[PDB]
Amino acid sequence: ACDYTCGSNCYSSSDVSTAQAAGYKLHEDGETVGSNSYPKKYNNYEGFDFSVSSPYYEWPILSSGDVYSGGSPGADRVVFNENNQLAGVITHTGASGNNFVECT
Ligand SMILES: Nc1nc2c(ncn2[C@@H]2O[C@H](CO)[C@@H](O)[C@H]2OP(=O)(O)O)c(=O)[nH]1
Ligand SMILES: [Ca+2]
Numbered sequence: 074a075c076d077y078t079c080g081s082n083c084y085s086s087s088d089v090s091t092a093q094a095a096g097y098k099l100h101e102d103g104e105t106v107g108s109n110s111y112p113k114k115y116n117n118y119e120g121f122d123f124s125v126s127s128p129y130y131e132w133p134i135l136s137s138g139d140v141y142s143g144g145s146p147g148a149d150r151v152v153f154n155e156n157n158q159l160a161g162v163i164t165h166t167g168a169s170g171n172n173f174v175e176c177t
């Protein structure tokens with residue numbers, strides 16, 4: 074079964090955990106990856122009611138299970154905070170434009 078389902082993508086908790094550990098580490102070293110500079114601040118334009126405190130950073134989670142390292146980031150993102158608490162998994166899939174919806 075899926076712990077998080079983002080459109081057609083299936084993610085297990087381990088998947089989220091491995092992406093999140095990668096995003097935070099980079100967040101801590103003050104480094105970026107890819108043309109869209111990840112991880113980056115997540116602004117909450119959407120106004121989702123996260124259970125963890127802001128500020129928020131987004132990093133891509135890939136359907137292949139590989140850790141993002143450049144090129145296409147895909148539509149899925151793992152959202153974490155300063156304390157490395159998971160806030161949520163979100164996706165551009167099924168969302169208009171560059172908006173996001175939460176993975177279910
Ligand atoms: N929609 C949306 N995008 C954000 C937010 N914070 C940063 N972004 C990024 O800014 C762009 C302009 O909205 C979005 O595509 C997204 O980049 P990503 O596509 O690379 O994740 C946010 O709260 N909402
Ligand atoms: Ca997986």
